[PDB]
Amino acid sequence: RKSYTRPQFRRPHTYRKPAMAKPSNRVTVESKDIAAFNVIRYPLTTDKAMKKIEENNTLTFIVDSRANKTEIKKAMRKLYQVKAVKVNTLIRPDGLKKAYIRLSAAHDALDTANKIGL
């Protein structure tokens, strides 16, 4: 405000007060213990799926089509006490998302399938 050393005037720097966090506008009760049930829908029992259970230690599921691989892994850990080493996904021509899930060979996919009921 005394001696300017540029050929054009630019806006001076003033004090800015940060905004406040308002009370939330969404007050619907959402349980945090049921999301895995939305993520993992049900298994598949086709011939290819059956062939993968025994020889590749792999299970096949229909999942929510907006889910990603990391959350599918976490949902597997929550719903069944198993550890997935690999998740592969595809979106079918009828619109549903399918997941091929390989277990860590310290668990038996056949025994997990028996417990699931398929």
């Binding site: 001696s3 300017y4 050393t5 540029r6 050929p7 054009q8 005037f9």
Partner: protein, 233 residues
């Protein structure tokens, strides 16, 4: 054994060392409102100004200005708290005495506000009137010296509506009128009236005819002087 401290000056001539950062204020691009508020003053200086508007650039001196502002300050109007306290005391007096007058006149003070000051001038109650010289729009007070001259009321034009507002306790005042003072300030008011009359009322013939403006810039004046000197002979 030998200090290695030395002078290592720089050359700032054309085509030499990179210069220090100079001050560019007089040659920079400013904001539009800055540029316009300077050019407005220049244009008001260069044009021919009629007397009715020119009279507002001829103000009262410094000493009389300060004295008059001091008098107005000592006769300033009462504030919100003071009015409330006085009215509450009047109310308790009336409560204890359902009879008897109450005398709710308020202490003597100056008259403030354009409507009330105009009324005091027109009814010839004002002993002296003070007018600010920078009211915008100027038509609000442009006629007041003529009214005061017509009614033979002493008046002055002073430098700031902000200073008048400070004297009376507000942000701004366009004009102020003194109608009466205490017995101790009579001499002050009389001397102030004499000086004010000397400057304004007693020079009405000049004030009504004198024009203003027509002021060249310094660069134009210097050019004219140098040309006159050059063409001598």
């Amino acid at each position: 054994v030998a200090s290695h401290f030395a002078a290592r000056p720089k050359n700032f001539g054309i085509g030499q060392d990179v210069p220090y950062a100079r001050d560019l204020s007089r040659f920079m691009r400013w904001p539009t409102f800055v540029t316009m508020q300077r050019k407005k003053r220049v244009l008001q200086r260069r044009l021919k100004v009629p007397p009715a508007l020119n009279q507002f650039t001829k103000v009262l001196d410094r000493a009389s200005r300060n004295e008059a502002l001091k008098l107005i300050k000592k006769y300033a109007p009462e504030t919100r708290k003071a009015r409330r306290e006085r009215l509450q005391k009047v109310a308790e007096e009336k409560k204890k005495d359902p009879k008897k007058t109450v005398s709710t006149k308020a202490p003597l003070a100056v008259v403030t506000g354009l409507q009330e000051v105009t009324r005091a001038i027109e009814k010839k109650q004002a002993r002296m009137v003070v007018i600010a010289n920078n009211v915008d729009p100027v038509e609000l007070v442009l006629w007041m010296p003529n009214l005061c001259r017509a009614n033979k009321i002493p008046y002055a034009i002073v430098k700031d509506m902000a200073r008048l507002g400070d004297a009376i306790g507000r942000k701004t005042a366009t004009c102020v009128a003194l109608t009466d003072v205490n017995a101790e300030d009579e001499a002050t008011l009389k001397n102030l009236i004499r000086s004010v009359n000397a400057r304004f009322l007693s020079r009405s013939d000049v004030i009504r005819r004198q024009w203003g403006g027509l002021q060249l810039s310094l660069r134009s004046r210097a050019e004219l002087r140098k040309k006159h000197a050059r063409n001598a002979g």
